Symmetry: D2
Subunit: 378 residues, 4 copies
Amino acid sequence: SMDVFWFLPTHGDGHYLGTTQGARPVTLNYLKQVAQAADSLGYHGVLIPTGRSCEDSWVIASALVPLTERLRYLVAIRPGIISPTVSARMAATLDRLSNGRLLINVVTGGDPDENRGDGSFLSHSERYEVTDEFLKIWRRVLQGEAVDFEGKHLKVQNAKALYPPVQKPYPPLYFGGSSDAAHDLAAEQVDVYLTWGEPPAAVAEKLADVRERAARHGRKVKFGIRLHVIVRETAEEAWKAADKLIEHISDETIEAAQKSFSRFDSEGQRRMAALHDGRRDNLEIAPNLWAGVGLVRGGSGTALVGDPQQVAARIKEYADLGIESFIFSGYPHLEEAYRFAELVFPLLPEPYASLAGRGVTNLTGPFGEMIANDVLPA
Amino acid sequence: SMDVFWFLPTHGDGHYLGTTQGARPVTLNYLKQVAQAADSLGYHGVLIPTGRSCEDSWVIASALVPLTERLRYLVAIRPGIISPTVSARMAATLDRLSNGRLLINVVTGGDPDENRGDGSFLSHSERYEVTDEFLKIWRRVLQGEAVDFEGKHLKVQNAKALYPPVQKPYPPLYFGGSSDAAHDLAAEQVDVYLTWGEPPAAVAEKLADVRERAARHGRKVKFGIRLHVIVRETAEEAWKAADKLIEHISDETIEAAQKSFSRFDSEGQRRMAALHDGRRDNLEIAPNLWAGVGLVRGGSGTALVGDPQQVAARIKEYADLGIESFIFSGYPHLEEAYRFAELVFPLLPEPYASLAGRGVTNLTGPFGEMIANDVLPA
Amino acid sequence: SMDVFWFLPTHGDGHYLGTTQGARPVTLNYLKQVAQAADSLGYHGVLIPTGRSCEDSWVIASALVPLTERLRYLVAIRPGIISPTVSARMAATLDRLSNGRLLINVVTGGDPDENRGDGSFLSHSERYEVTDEFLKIWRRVLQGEAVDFEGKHLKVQNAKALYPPVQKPYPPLYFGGSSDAAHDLAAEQVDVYLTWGEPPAAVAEKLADVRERAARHGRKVKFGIRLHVIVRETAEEAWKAADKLIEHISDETIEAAQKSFSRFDSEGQRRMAALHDGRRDNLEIAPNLWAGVGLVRGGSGTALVGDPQQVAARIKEYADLGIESFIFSGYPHLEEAYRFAELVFPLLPEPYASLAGRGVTNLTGPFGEMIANDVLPA
Amino acid sequence: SMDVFWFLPTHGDGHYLGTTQGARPVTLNYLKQVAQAADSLGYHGVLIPTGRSCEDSWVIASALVPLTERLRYLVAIRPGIISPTVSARMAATLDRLSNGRLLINVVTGGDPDENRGDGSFLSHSERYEVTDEFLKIWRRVLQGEAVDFEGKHLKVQNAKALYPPVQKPYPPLYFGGSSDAAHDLAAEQVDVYLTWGEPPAAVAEKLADVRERAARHGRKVKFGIRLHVIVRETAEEAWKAADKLIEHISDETIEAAQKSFSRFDSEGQRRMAALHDGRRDNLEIAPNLWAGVGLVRGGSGTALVGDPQQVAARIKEYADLGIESFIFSGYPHLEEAYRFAELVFPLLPEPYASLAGRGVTNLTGPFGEMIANDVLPA
Ligand SMILES: Cc1cc2nc3c(=O)[nH]c(=O)nc-3n(C[C@H](O)[C@H](O)[C@H](O)COP(=O)(O)O)c2cc1C
Ligand SMILES: Cc1cc2nc3c(=O)[nH]c(=O)nc-3n(C[C@H](O)[C@H](O)[C@H](O)COP(=O)(O)O)c2cc1C
Ligand SMILES: Cc1cc2nc3c(=O)[nH]c(=O)nc-3n(C[C@H](O)[C@H](O)[C@H](O)COP(=O)(O)O)c2cc1C
Ligand SMILES: Cc1cc2nc3c(=O)[nH]c(=O)nc-3n(C[C@H](O)[C@H](O)[C@H](O)COP(=O)(O)O)c2cc1C
Ligand code: NA
């Protein structure tokens, strides 16, 4: 079993990184194009990023829910900048309108400059104390309880969400974080622990630690991984596409991004930037794992590059560690959603092996362009 | 010079108040029905309420924006439970996706229990201090400024909204409130001051008060009024429908509703609850002004009742006081939106006079159901 | 079993017949309103009329299919004015796009003036000869057969529809007609025989006649009835609403309508026109069967008028005769669709009994408008 | 000025011709993707093919109209298989539902086998006599006339289209045909004369003939061209992409299509098949004009292949001949719609030079994926 996600580029899209050449603006029509493509191609869901660099995740997810049928939306909540009772009501409303298609990504926010801009002057350990108290109120409120809670940071009295969610006990909690406090938080409250595309050896160590701490609370959590993907029919086309993706990036842009990454107080972000060292050489840190994206883009900075057989093999290596969720992305996000679904889906377990080419449809007849007006293609 | 709004019943709908008989569940489909009706009928916009008793306003409005073309959405924000910078990004995104169809209703929250349920333990004077600092940050960030602010309650450092809104300088701010702190805040920062359906005499005093305080800041504030409406072809049918609206309300529900109203420290709620005092008699506090709605429903608790000429007469009276915005509602909200547009619109100024019956359309030809198969109606 | 249909007023809508007072123009917005209401309220489908007085059924049905989830569309085909091979491809495409939600209403056309306007100069028997040959090509082509056909009226060689339909062997064939040629055609080729709202005794004879002729061919056809419905909470309101429907109808308009009906060459139209005799008196030709609609409207000219228990009883009577399909309509079509579902559905067999009031939804919680802000309705 | 159309692959889509490898089935979701992409990218419209090899044009176009805002639809009508009065009502309905976004492609049918399959046993000259009589009735009824027409093939009495279209006097008539009868028909009745992708010298002779024949009637006929496009950043990429397109085409499939084209009774099809005569070598019949598509595809069988400067240059060569409309297509039709708009639109006249990259968008701010979370791309 495997859940394959796509990605909504709410922070912008294009053919090349760190530039405006071939860039596509974030519009409702284009986001609808990507979401409906992922919905019809059979992706389990789409991840919506959050932060100052992105449009609001909740406005986007809510606008695309009535325009899609089965696609699930992994939406980020940010404790510390919103009341947990209100956030719970937001999740309840969106889960009700979507008929149980809401997934929650718990985000603590690793940029102190962004946090101060939102009015949150908490330290790294305080952000996780807030998130811990946030989730405890959030989870109980969505289970129908009038909550009285008085913590170090948050205090509510008679917190109630009158409209229950569709998913019981609440929309599943996804969480990504690499710090010690992050692993304690995931082990206690979250349902799925997420990691960025570190090499398999590093991901194995992070999974073993989360599984160990989850055993102390008598819990078993699931695991997912966030990776870019540059797959082509051959590996030579894939590496050429990987090279062209960062060819228009000047050293003034690389050094500016790494300088902004040094300001971040995020254990996961530092581990990602440490893979490429801010240089253009040795970007293939592992077989078919390419760290060129991290030179400019924050967060996910690695990509699987190669033919379909190679990309599938690297997906199996991660799956052998206990990873069941895979959140992929490509540039541009519309075309690469079709590319990954056509090249990689037939090599993945069901239902993705059967969803390839056809998609979510039951139609037959002339499959492909008709030869003249009386010859079926073969 | 008139904008006519309708209302999305995100707190529940039905044919009768208090009871569940004839109640209509609020789903995505039914909200699409109401929103698309007001859009096609030519209403300027719809009001979406906020609170523990309602679904989330932002999730609802975002879900209905891609499903309408011209309809504006008056969406409520509540300072004190969400970061002002994050709220500005939410407003920017929705205003961009809707192409400038977003309107903001500033809500301070008049129920101390609901405020404590969300984590806010502020007094009446402190809630307006937070809103005042909230709006100052909110209005400046949406204008492209990197804001440094340090007030009594809020503190931001390098607050920025990277995606500018469509409406300049920002989506217009609507505000309702009758306390002295409310009128000072309305005079300084809001664009439209809203009032509930009080008799014209009391509305004129509140309007004259806000208008004078706003003059000290050099601002010309617009005025709107929130009112229920029960309009029928004759005045006799209207009073029958008003009686049926409350015929299934027991005295134990009235006491439970008024017991909650006394908990509210809201000045506007106190003035509305004092018009009926829980009585079932003397509900016509003014010519064609019926206060039966306020027996169980908080907020707007008065209604215009009568034939189209009587309802339009009360509307012109309010308009002669300087009121340019009108937010109406009826039970059930779908049918009454058509009834009001078909009975009252032809009696209102343009464009509502021309929008009567036809609506926002350019189609010609047979008007009405055809006679036989070749005889046009006349 | 029981399938309950609604009706799309593609020939115009309104509150009153004959006149233009309270008329609603047929627009894409309003047809979306009616279709999406019937879809969400749980109706099995909607009937779309065809003819000179209506917008094209195939364009309307195709435009609303992507905007609805489970609603079926009973679309009309008229042999003699379109190639059966092309019509077969149209049915295949719409059935494929709707994922098997297409239903076919075979219409022979009962107005010689309209038929001549379309280029058809066939007599009554010749129209049924064309229809009989049409359906044979239509059914064989949709079953994947390369058809050579040389009949009296139609001639095709190597007729093929390369895209098969979702429903096998083809979308079901509904047919309405009262002539002897109609009963032969229905007994031999159609799946469901439809009749207008005649008294149960007259319906029983037509049903027995069709059933006997189908037995001779070794076939069993189902039966449905087409009726208007004016249902109110009490019987007195229903009869008052029936009087309002024809209060704005002048005798000059009745005479012009009945003069056009005498031009028609349809047995079913004459049987319907013979129920009211072109007069306003004795319109209740049967218990709760009111023939006032036929005084101006062509086709369905009777209505079920009464309280829910009275309407549900007349439905049960028809169902005792073997009728399993019920195609209802009301004025206006949007509001009356909710009225019938909220009043009659609880008195109908499953699933209409469980779909009553709530529609097709899995939402729980506060049912009805909230009392104050923490008191659930009861 | 210039109108740039795209193409809906209602006959099938994919990456490679002649084979099922990489093929995409014609589904509602995929067609919605292609149409909404062309709508948002700024294309003037899309062409929808008709015939036995495709899904029905009217069903497809009607289903996509409510899902698009500005995109126009060039929909085919085929005289001889449908009544002109019925066809005019379909055009009136779709033009009204789309608010004037309907265009008509007049198709006579060049395949005798496909025509006989639809019940039309007319010769080449007879098909143009039917079309001439069809269009006279079609154009007159849409102008609000009760038409009496008695011709050699068609006879109508009191033909009326009750619902007038939005476009006056009627939706524009596009027409393609290279025979002498076609050029007479285009000079007299049609608004836009279309030609397939012949070399510029052969196009100039056809346009000069039509212009001369139309001047005798005092009419000016707009000119358009239909062409596939394989454009890439470099010329070598485009030529390699063109080779990949036909690399899976078996020589037995080429002969299976050329023998099918010999049966056709179309002068324009013969002129297209005479450009290569099945020869696999030297398919570049003109600078950047590649006839590789004509090996297996009927109708349009030539493509523009080259870098953006070469493709734009060939477009300007056709424009100087007087061609104002361009109907382009590519494989696959979704990805190639973006490729052409992003690569060729900036080299085209307004408004396509402004629609490049930006598209129909008034949004400002970040343009492309954000560098980190505060640095905008440049
Ligand atoms: C898969 C994944 C997705 C994430 N998405 C976001 C996001 O959208 N916005 C964000 O600010 N942080 C995101 N993060 C990062 C964390 O949620 C959080 O901001 C912080 O970096 C965790 O800090 P830590 O590694 O020091 O424990 C994501 C992390 C992962 C692994
Ligand atoms: C037109 C209008 C709409 C309002 N909408 C809301 C709402 O949706 N939620 C809410 O809590 N309060 C709403 N209020 C009430 C005030 O915004 C605020 O909550 C408080 O009651 C004002 O307190 P005050 O009158 O003492 O200054 C509304 C008021 C008006 C006039
Ligand atoms: C339920 C029902 C629906 C019908 N719908 C249509 C229609 O939409 N357009 C139409 O022209 N005739 C319609 N008819 C009438 C017949 O299909 C046909 O046109 C003709 O009147 C039958 O003639 P006959 O009774 O003499 O056999 C309908 C009949 C029934 C019973
Ligand atoms: C741009 C263009 C589009 C056409 N589209 C179609 C079509 O969709 N279906 C079709 O059968 N023929 C199509 N044709 C061909 C003609 O409409 C017609 O079928 C026939 O080939 C003309 O015959 P002629 O060249 O001998 O005058 C098209 C022609 C052109 C130039
Ligand atoms: Na390193």
